[PDB]
C-alpha cells in the first residue's frame, strides 16, 4: 500500500483539449489507410476555435487537417458542439507491429482560427489493425503467433514501485527471449510501460483491475449489480486512458472474478466504444460470452480436464467443441515456478500445428521475492512468511522465468 | 448407400466429373440408386461414389439428393474430403496426429482437420486402417481420439474381406490366388487383400 507511482501538477488552459482518440483504418491491402482523430475540449465554446491534426513520420509531416467545433448530427437533439473528428489520408503507411516498432507522431492543436495556439497534447501512433476473422487473430491481415508472457510490477527493493530502467531491463531481456507480447497480469501498467512497449515493439493485454478469486462463488460479486459501478469505472477508466496506444491490442476484463452479468455488461461497453480491440476474459470457463478468444489458463495439450462447471479442455479439442470457432490463445500457461517448464515443447509443437491454436501466455516473467538482511547486514529473498505476515502462501509467489534482479533461470 | 461411380484411373481424377457431357451418365447412377433404396431404413447417408476427384458434375448430384431426399445426409470424399459435395468430412487415411499436406489436396491429422478456420462439420472416415496383411497397428489410436472429440465420430475400416480367388493345383487342392495369378496383367499383385478376415471369413 501506499502512493507508490508518480505524483504530478499540470496546467491546463480554461478552453481545452479534454479528450482524444486517434483510429486508424485500411483498405483491403494495407496501401491506403485514413486516420481519424476524434478531439473534445472544455470551456467557452467559440467560432473562432480550431483543432488542427498533423501527423509526423521523423521531421516529416505527412498529413494534416483543420476543423472548426462542431460534430456531425447523431440524434433529434444535434450533435457534440464540443467535439470535432479530423480524418487523414496516408497512403502507404509503415505498418506497427511487434517485429518492426514502426511510429508516426501525432500532434494535437487547440487554436484560434487566425493561428493562436492555446494548447498542444500529442501521442505516438501506431498503424496496425487488429482484428478476429474466420477464427483467427490477425495483425493488419496476418495470423499472429502469441509468443507471450505475463509480468506483474515487481522490484525485490522497492516493491511495486516501478522505475524506467527496470522496465526497459525486462524489454529487452523478452525480447532477446524471443518473446513478442505482454499481458498487464493483473491490472493496468504504469503509464511508461506502454510507451515503451509501443517504442521497442511487444503486444500487450490491458486488463482491468478486477480480480474477487477469495470468493465464495468467484463471481459472488461480478453477478452482483451493486458491485457494477466499482467494476464499470475500473474498465472504462482503463479505456479512456490507455485506448490510442498502438502496442494494446486486447482489452481484458480483469483475473479470477468468475463469470457474471457485469462482466457481460462490460464487456458490451467496450466493443461499443473501442471496436478496434478484441475483449477476452477468462473467468468462468474461458470460453463464455463476455470473451471473444478462448482464453483458458493451464489448459493441458492433450489431457483434458473435466472439471463440473469449468473444464479445462485439451487445447487441440477445445477448438472443435460443437458450435466452437474462435481463436484460442492462453492468458497462462506453462507455470515457470522453480525447476519446471516441462513439456514447454509440446506447447509450441500444437501452436504450430493448429491455425486456431495462437499462442498464449507464460506464467510468469519475474519471482515476486523481496530482499531482507541477516544479523551480518547481508541481503537475501525472502517469500511468502517471511515478514511475520500469515496467513500466506510461502513460496507460490515465485514462478518468474528470472530472479527479482532479472537473473535468468 | 454409394452410387456406382470411380474414375479413379483418369489424370487428373476429375477429368470426367467436370465434364457437362458425362452429367447424364453420372446422374443414372445416383438418381436411380436414391429411387430403390430410399425406403430403407438401415440406409443413413447418401455417397456420391469414390475416388472421382471433385467436378462440378458432383455439386449438382449433391443438390439433387438433398433437394429429393432431405432426411440423409450425403458425403463424398474426392477433391480433398471436405468439398461443397460433402457434409461430411470424411477423409481416407488421415492420420490421428501427423497432417500429411499433400498439395491441393492434403490430409490433416483429423484432430485438426476439425478446427481449421471456418470449419464445422462432424468428421467420419471413409477409409482407415488400412488392414493389407499383418495389419491394423495403431488402431487403438484412433479409438482414443474418436472418444475423446465429439465431432470424430469414427469411421469405416478398410477393409471387410480379402478379394482372393480359389485356384486348384494339379492334385485338385484349392489355394488362395491374387492379382496375376489367371495371366491377368497387368496386375496390383496382393492389393486386393486388406480383409479383417480372409476370403472364407477366417478371422484375421
Ligand atoms: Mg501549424
Ligand atoms: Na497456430
Ligand atoms: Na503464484
Ligand atoms: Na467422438
Ligand atoms: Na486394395
Same mark, same amino acid.
Given at each position: 500500500? %501506499?502512493?507508490?507511482?508518480?505524483?504530478?501538477?499540470?496546467?491546463?488552459?480554461?478552453?481545452?483539449?479534454?479528450?482524444?482518440?486517434?483510429?486508424?483504418?485500411?483498405?483491403?491491402?494495407?496501401?491506403?489507410?485514413?486516420?481519424?482523430?476524434?478531439?473534445?475540449? +472544455?470551456?467557452?465554446? !467559440? =467560432?473562432?476555435?480550431? #483543432?488542427?491534426?498533423?501527423?509526423?513520420?521523423?521531421?516529416?509531416?505527412?498529413?494534416?487537417?483543420?476543423?472548426?467545433?462542431?460534430?456531425?448530427?447523431?440524434?433529434?437533439?444535434?450533435?457534440?458542439?464540443?467535439?470535432?473528428?479530423?480524418?487523414?489520408?496516408?497512403?502507404?503507411?509503415?505498418?506497427?507491429?511487434?517485429? *518492426?516498432?514502426?511510429?508516426?507522431?501525432?500532434?494535437?492543436?487547440?487554436?484560434?482560427?487566425?493561428?493562436?495556439? *492555446?494548447?498542444?497534447?500529442?501521442?505516438? #501512433?501506431?498503424?496496425?489493425? #487488429?482484428?478476429?476473422?474466420?477464427?483467427?487473430?490477425?495483425?493488419?491481415?496476418?495470423?499472429?503467433?502469441?509468443?507471450?508472457?505475463?509480468?506483474?510490477?515487481?522490484?525485490?527493493?522497492?516493491?511495486?514501485?516501478?522505475?524506467?530502467?527496470?522496465?526497459?531491463?525486462?524489454?529487452?531481456?523478452?525480447?532477446?527471449?524471443?518473446?513478442?507480447? #505482454?499481458? +498487464?497480469?493483473?491490472?493496468?501498467?504504469?503509464?511508461?510501460?506502454?510507451?515503451?512497449?509501443?517504442?521497442?515493439?511487444?503486444?500487450?493485454?490491458?486488463?482491468?483491475?478486477?480480480?474477487?478469486? %477469495?470468493?465464495?462463488?468467484?463471481? !459472488?460479486?461480478?453477478?452482483?449489480?451493486?458491485?457494477?459501478?466499482?467494476?464499470?469505472?475500473?474498465?472504462?477508466?482503463?479505456?479512456?486512458?490507455?485506448?490510442?496506444?498502438?502496442?494494446?491490442?486486447?482489452?481484458?476484463?480483469?483475473?479470477?472474478?468468475?463469470?457474471?452479468?457485469?462482466?457481460?455488461?462490460?464487456?458490451?461497453? *467496450?466493443?461499443?466504444?473501442?471496436?478496434?480491440?478484441?475483449?477476452?476474459?477468462?473467468?468462468?470457463?474461458?470460453?463464455?460470452?463476455?470473451?471473444?478468444?478462448? +482464453?483458458?489458463?493451464?489448459?493441458?495439450?492433450?489431457?483434458?480436464?473435466?472439471?463440473?462447471?469449468?473444464?479445462?479442455?485439451?487445447?487441440?479439442?477445445?477448438?472443435?467443441?460443437?458450435?466452437?470457432?474462435?481463436?484460442?490463445?492462453?492468458?497462462? $500457461?506453462?507455470?515457470?515456478?522453480?525447476?519446471?517448464?516441462?513439456?514447454?515443447?509440446?506447447?509450441?509443437?500444437?501452436?504450430?500445428? $493448429?491455425?486456431?491454436?495462437?499462442? %498464449?501466455?507464460?506464467?510468469?516473467?519475474?519471482?515476486?521475492?523481496?530482499?531482507?538482511?541477516?544479523?551480518?547486514?547481508?541481503?537475501?529473498?525472502?517469500? %511468502?512468511? =517471511?515478514?511475520?505476515?500469515?496467513?500466506?502462501?510461502?513460496?507460490?509467489?515465485?514462478?518468474?522465468?528470472?530472479?527479482?534482479?532479472?537473473?535468468?533461470?
Amino acid at each position: 500500500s %501506499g502512493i507508490f507511482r508518480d505524483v504530478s501538477l499540470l496546467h491546463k488552459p480554461t478552453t481545452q483539449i479534454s479528450d482524444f482518440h486517434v483510429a486508424t483504418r485500411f483498405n483491403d491491402d494495407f496501401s491506403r489507410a485514413v486516420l481519424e482523430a476524434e478531439v473534445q475540449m +472544455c470551456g467557452e465554446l !467559440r =467560432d473562432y476555435l480550431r #483543432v488542427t491534426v498533423s501527423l509526423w513520420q521523423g521531421e516529416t509531416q505527412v498529413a494534416s487537417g483543420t476543423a472548426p467545433f462542431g460534430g456531425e448530427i447523431i440524434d433529434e437533439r444535434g450533435g457534440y458542439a464540443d467535439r470535432v473528428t479530423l480524418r487523414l489520408n496516408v497512403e502507404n503507411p509503415k505498418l506497427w507491429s511487434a517485429e *518492426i516498432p514502426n511510429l508516426y507522431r501525432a500532434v494535437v492543436e487547440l487554436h484560434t482560427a487566425d493561428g493562436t495556439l *492555446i494548447e498542444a497534447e500529442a501521442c505516438d #501512433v501506431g498503424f496496425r489493425e #487488429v482484428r478476429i476473422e474466420n477464427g483467427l487473430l490477425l495483425l493488419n491481415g496476418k495470423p499472429l503467433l502469441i509468443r507471450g508472457v505475463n509480468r506483474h510490477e515487481h522490484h525485490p527493493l522497492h516493491g511495486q514501485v516501478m522505475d524506467e530502467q527496470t522496465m526497459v531491463q525486462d524489454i529487452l531481456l523478452m525480447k532477446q527471449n524471443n518473446f513478442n507480447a #505482454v499481458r +498487464c497480469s493483473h491490472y493496468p501498467n504504469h503509464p511508461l510501460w506502454y510507451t515503451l512497449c509501443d517504442r521497442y515493439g511487444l503486444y500487450v493485454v490491458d486488463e482491468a483491475n478486477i480480480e474477487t478469486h %477469495g470468493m465464495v462463488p468467484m463471481n !459472488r460479486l461480478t453477478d452482483d449489480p451493486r458491485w457494477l459501478p466499482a467494476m464499470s469505472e475500473r474498465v472504462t477508466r482503463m479505456v479512456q486512458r490507455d485506448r490510442n496506444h498502438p502496442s494494446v491490442i486486447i482489452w481484458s476484463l480483469g483475473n479470477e472474478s468468475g463469470h457474471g452479468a457485469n462482466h457481460d455488461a462490460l464487456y458490451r461497453w *467496450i466493443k461499443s466504444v473501442d471496436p478496434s480491440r478484441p475483449v477476452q476474459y477468462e473467468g468462468g470457463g474461458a470460453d463464455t460470452t463476455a470473451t471473444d478468444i478462448i +482464453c483458458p489458463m493451464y489448459a493441458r495439450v492433450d489431457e483434458d480436464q473435466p472439471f463440473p462447471a469449468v473444464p479445462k479442455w485439451s487445447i487441440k479439442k477445445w477448438l472443435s467443441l460443437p458450435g466452437e470457432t474462435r481463436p484460442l490463445i492462453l492468458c497462462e $500457461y506453462a507455470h515457470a515456478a522453480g525447476n519446471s517448464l516441462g513439456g514447454f515443447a509440446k506447447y509450441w509443437q500444437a501452436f504450430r500445428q $493448429y491455425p486456431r491454436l495462437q499462442g %498464449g501466455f507464460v506464467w510468469d516473467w519475474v519471482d515476486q521475492s523481496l530482499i531482507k538482511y541477516d544479523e551480518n547486514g547481508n541481503p537475501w529473498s525472502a517469500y %511468502g512468511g =517471511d515478514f511475520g505476515d500469515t496467513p500466506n502462501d510461502r513460496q507460490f509467489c515465485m514462478n518468474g522465468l528470472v530472479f527479482a534482479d532479472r537473473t535468468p533461470h
